[PDB]
Amino acid sequence: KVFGRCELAAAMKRHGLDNYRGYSLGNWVCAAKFESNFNTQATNRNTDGSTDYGILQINSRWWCNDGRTPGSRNLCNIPCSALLSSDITASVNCAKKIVSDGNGMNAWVAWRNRCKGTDVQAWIRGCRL
Numbered sequence: 001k002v003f004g005r006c007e008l009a010a011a012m013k014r015h016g017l018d019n020y021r022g023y024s025l026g027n028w029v030c031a032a033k034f035e036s037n038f039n040t041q042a043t044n045r046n047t048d049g050s051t052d053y054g055i056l057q058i059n060s061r062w063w064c065n066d067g068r069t070p071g072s073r074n075l076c077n078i079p080c081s082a083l084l085s086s087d088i089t090a091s092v093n094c095a096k097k098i099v100s101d102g103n104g105m106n107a108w109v110a111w112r113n114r115c116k117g118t119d120v121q122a123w124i125r126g127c128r129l
């Protein structure tokens, strides 16, 4: 599923991400936009053999199991395929653990380089929330 900007914002809000760990909703929508262009099915391979999955490009090196990332962790306790669902619950639940692991949203490289320090509030303009 390719979410619309405001549709995503609402699903994210619903799932408790607005201000999760002090990160306003515009942060999460901006991260999604640049990580996967709002596509739940996005997948990208890393040079170490690990793979990033879904709307928030969660890395199999640490957060999910894809049975093809030798000696990696499965911190969210889920198969990586669960992160490609049209339903973002798994993605959001796992994101919540990631953001609290010490580095905040710096865990998301697109967030750090394209969202961090910008006017993220623009990402939720005109949405009924």
Ligand SMILES: CC(=O)N[C@@H]1[C@@H](O)[C@H](O[C@@H]2O[C@H](CO)[C@@H](O[C@@H]3O[C@H](CO)[C@@H](O[C@@H]4O[C@H](CO)[C@@H](O)[C@H](O)[C@H]4NC(C)=O)[C@H](O)[C@H]3NC(C)=O)[C@H](O)[C@H]2NC(C)=O)[C@@H](CO)O[C@H]1O
Binding pocket: 035, 044, 046, 047, 052, 056, 057, 058, 059, 060, 061, 062, 063, 098, 101, 102, 103, 107, 108, 109, 110
């Ligand atoms: C090609 C490319 O760069 N692809 C991107 C993917 O790398 C990227 O996924 C992110 O990958 C980084 C590097 O593996 C990963 O960051 C690591 O995350 C762990 C887990 O939290 C950190 O370890 C913790 O460190 C803190 C602070 O030191 C400790 O207190 C804590 O105990 C540690 N946790 C554990 C379990 O040991 C690492 O410090 C950190 N490594 C680096 C180099 O920063 C991110 O978690 C990955 N992000 C996500 C969302 O999965 C992917 C996603 O945007 O983007 C690809 O393009």
